[PDB]
Amino acid sequence: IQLTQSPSSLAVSAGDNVTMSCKSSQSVLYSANHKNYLAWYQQKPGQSPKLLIYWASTRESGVPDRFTGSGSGTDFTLTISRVQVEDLAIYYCHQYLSSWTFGGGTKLEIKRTVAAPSVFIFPPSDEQLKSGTASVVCLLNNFYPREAKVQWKVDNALQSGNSQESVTEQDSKDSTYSLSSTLTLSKADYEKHKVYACEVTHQGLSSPVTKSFNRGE
Amino acid sequence: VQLQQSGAELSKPGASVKMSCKASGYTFTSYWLHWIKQRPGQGLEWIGYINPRNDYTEYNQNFKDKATLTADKSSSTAYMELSSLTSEDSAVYYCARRDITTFYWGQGTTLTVSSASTKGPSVFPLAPGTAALGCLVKDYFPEPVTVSWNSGALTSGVHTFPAVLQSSGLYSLSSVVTVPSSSLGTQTYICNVNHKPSNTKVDKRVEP
Ligand SMILES: *[C@@H]1O[C@H](CO[C@@H]2O[C@@H](C)[C@@H](O)[C@@H](O)[C@@H]2O)[C@@H](O[C@@H]2O[C@H](CO)[C@@H](O)[C@H](O)[C@H]2NC(C)=O)[C@H](O)[C@H]1NC(C)=O
Question: What's the CATH number of domain B112-208, 3.40.190.170, 2.60.40.10, 3.40.1190.10, 1.10.760.10?
């Protein structure tokens, strides 16, 4: 039995209504007790999946009434009424007629208004430089939506391929993201150049924001 | 009812690993015991189940050569062995079973498959109206590390980023916090780093 979930991801503002679909390739309705062997799980970031609904429409203990499961046979729906910021999670459906199957999940993100990042640049530490490698770090703080670009420049020379980025989960309160970009240089290359800069773009920025430092100043 | 799974697992490629799921609070042979794989970009995937009453096993076709499920009635413990390990087998694994009004899941066992060997991080300061400061937690294996600030007295504005896997096979992450610039001369800022696999503990003062 195959499970198809749609949409794969969506962003919805707090207070609005959410509907997500789970369709099975075969009926999971058991004729003997007239129950659908379908459940819904909520998996918040960093946590294990938590059971929300079983028998397609029965809420697990503790689950608030704003979560409603519906459908029968092959077509099922999870509705979240007046979404709250704590409802950010990936929602999975699960059929358990005999063997088990899981859907591909619907990632629920919290939509909010656009916020441009604040930018900070960090030189490599003197301690790290004693080791032959230099890490330059730029921080992009409290922005939305998730997409952003960090362009590293070394004496105005555009860098490529020697950076890695990492993005936080949405903040539990304000739903923003933060991002760290790390530029990795040999110590030899780092001490050969003076001006280190990270140039940041984001859909909320009318023009790029650049933060920079001069080595040894 | 409790499903207690064994601790985190680390393996070199090509080897095998065996994890356990200890059941308590019910008759072990009365319910099938399922196993589930959770890999970052692969959602949740059912592996298979064992019927502990008779040792019969049923597998997801994708795992028929990867997983071997066994059970020990006397100790109320189920086992899953994963063989011919590759980095594709790195994931969180659960055991689970169903009940009349709920499902019971184990707490999960994390498996990392890599040619890397356990190694503690190096911790470097990220030096600073608003100032940012942080700590670079570089070149450690395996995950995870934990970072706190001022022994937990500082939480607001802290961002500890997900680790990135470097080309060396080692992980690196940064933890940052934003504070008033006017506080830098009156308040100490210390990142508390813990890497339990290597027993590494580092508490670094971060100053301009
Ligand atoms: C968001 O949905 C709520 C709830 O309505 C749904 O109605 C059912 C058919 C079913 O889909 C359930 O899951 C939900 O409960 C809407 O609130 C209703 O609004 C009307 C008009 O104002 C009112 O008469 C009802 O009493 C309200 N019901 C509740 C429970 O408050 C709400 O309007 C929807 N909001 C948006 C923006 O679509």
Answer: 2.60.40.10
Q: State the amino acid at position A27 in one-letter form.
A: S
- Of A160, A181, A178, whose CA–CA distance to A168 is shortest? A178
Domain that holds residue A125: 112-217
- Experimental technique of record: X-ray
8 Å CB contact of A128 and B34? no
Q: Chain A residue with minimal CA distance to B58?
A: A99
Q: Which of A53, A81, A83, A111 to mutate to test the pocket of ligand 1 (most atoms within 8 A of CB)?
A: A81
Last residue of a domain, one of A64, A95, A111: A111
Resolution of the deposited coordinates, in angstroms?
A: 1.7
- Residue to test with chain B: of A22, A42, A100, most B Cβ within 10 A: A100
Q: What sign does the dihedral B112-B116-B117-B120 (CA atoms) show?
A: negative
- The answer to whether the CB of A180 falls within 8 A of the CB of A117 is no
**Residue found by looking up tokens 């001006």 in the block:** A195
> B101: which chain A residues are within 8 Å (Cβ-Cβ)?
54, 61
